[PDB]
Structure 1
Amino acid sequence: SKGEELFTGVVPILVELDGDVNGHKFSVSGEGEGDATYGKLTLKFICTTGKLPVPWPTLVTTFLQCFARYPDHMKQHDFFKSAMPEGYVQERTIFFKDDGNYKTRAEVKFEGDTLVNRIELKGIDFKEDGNILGHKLEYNYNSSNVYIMADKQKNGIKVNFKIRHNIEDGSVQLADHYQQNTPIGDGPVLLPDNHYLSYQSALSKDPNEKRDHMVLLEFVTAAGIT
């Protein structure tokens, strides 16, 4: 079985990120599970290399759009599942307004019965005491919309959206995200009509975990096509 069928149940997820932000190197491991039928992800991330040198909320968007719930009438527009199990490559630049930038490359594919997202992230030109390195961002998340359109020129899609990280003084740190996805395997794939994914998310902590970590729950629904 392969394609829009592998996500009918709960699917285990793995995340591996090796990072370098302004020369500060770190690694994060995550695990949990997803159920695309309900548009639900549940993940816990632990920084295995010590103190995370950037705020957890700045990595939420980095840490599985294949688990979006697409309505039946939108089900023929779900690129992410249509590319599975071969998977896709995910690339981003994330521009933090008046601060540094992130660049990410990720691989999403089925390894056995587990979906695995392996990510590399490098960040540069961040201020030593900016909102990111100075840990001035509130630990919370707002509701966002993620806009998707086809990029036929690359046999993939182009995606962009803008996240708004709340700062402890009531101001906002903006993060302009630009992303494109192309399949990892060589083959057909579904290219969508213009549409968006509606995101809601929640961050918490595990009271019994001694290490720096993040527990994350996401709800994802496709919309924008009538």
Structure 2
Amino acid sequence: MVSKGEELFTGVVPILVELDGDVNGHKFSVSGEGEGDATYGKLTLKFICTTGKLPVPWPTLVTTFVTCFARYPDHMRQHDFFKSAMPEGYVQERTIFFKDDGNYKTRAEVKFEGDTLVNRIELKGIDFKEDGNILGHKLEYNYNSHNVYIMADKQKNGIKANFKIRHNIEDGSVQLADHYQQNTPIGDGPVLLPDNHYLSYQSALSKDPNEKRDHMVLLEFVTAAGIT
């Protein structure tokens, strides 16, 4: 049997992303469009800064900008919280601590609006150094592969994770971004609370050569792996 959640992701699904941000008082908005194909764990998205020049590096927003598109292998299907919460969706919240710098706090609602999977996000950043790696745009426009360990959060009826993102800097060092995450369902319907498992991410950042606005093109693959 294919679950109600699973069935919404069997083909290619349009994605809309909307982010309102404020970092050290610098307000900005970003809109993204593209498509997800969960069968292949595949996301393609193009993000546009709709208010001017982005005041933080595009790589710092990659994790913020739809884990329902992860590929869960057949043997792992009982651990897919994210699809099980659909179509009503889930709230994803994070704090992201940039080592020796500021932090982001994010809240997103991920849910269907008709046939479109929407990721609506608010982001607030505080305590950034005006000449640190973030406000000083010292990060390379690239992205490393990362594994994220997903744990059930029984009390909140959802999941949680903590993971470290490494953002490469041109002197060979990295800027660490320590993510703490909680997800909880929007509906009061049944969800899958998983056993501990990993999601394996790879992400590629590029540019649309014909786009004059400040923007990012993201290609991301996400696959679950178990602990058996």
- TM-score bracket, normalised by the shorter chain, equals over 0.9
Tell me how many residue pairs correspond in the alignment: 226
Instruction: Please state how far the C-alpha of 1:76 moved relative to its aligned partner.
Output: 1.1
Mapped to 1, the partners of 2:85 and 2:162 lie a distance apart of: 20
Instruction: Please state how far the C-alpha of 1:159 moved relative to its aligned partner.
Output: 1.1
Instruction: Please state how far the C-alpha of 1:225 moved relative to its aligned partner.
Output: 3.3
TM-score, with structure 2 as normaliser = 0.98
Residue-by-residue CA offset, 1:172-209 (whole Å, 9 max, x unaligned): 10000000000001121100000010000100000000
SS at match of 1:66: helix
Unaligned ranges ≥5, structure 1: none
Over 4 Å off, 4+ runs: none
Unaligned ranges ≥5, structure 2: none
Q: Contact (CA 8 Å) 2:94, 2:107: kept in 1 or not?
A: yes
Q: Contact (CA 8 Å) 1:74, 1:225: kept in 2 or not?
A: no
Mapped to 1, the partners of 2:200 and 2:53 lie a distance apart of: 32
Q: Which residue pairs with 2:9 in the alignment? A: 7
Q: Contact (CA 8 Å) 2:76, 2:226: kept in 1 or not?
A: no
Residue-by-residue CA offset, 1:41-100 (whole Å, 9 max, x unaligned): 000001010000000000001001111100111011100001000100010000000000
TM-score, with structure 1 as normaliser = 0.99
Residue-by-residue CA offset, 1:107-165 (whole Å, 9 max, x unaligned): 00010000000000000000010000000001100110111010001111111111000
Q: Contact (CA 8 Å) 1:196, 1:223: kept in 2 or not?
A: yes
Mapped to 1, the partners of 2:226 and 2:131 lie a distance apart of: 40
Instruction: Please state how far the C-alpha of 1:21 moved relative to its aligned partner.
Output: 0.2
SS at match of 1:105: strand
Mapped to 2, the partners of 1:42 and 1:20 lie a distance apart of: 25
Q: Which residue pairs with 1:47 in the alignment? A: 49
Mapped to 2, the partners of 1:187 and 1:26 lie a distance apart of: 35
Q: Which residue pairs with 1:110 in the alignment? A: 112
Q: Which residue pairs with 2:225 in the alignment? A: 223
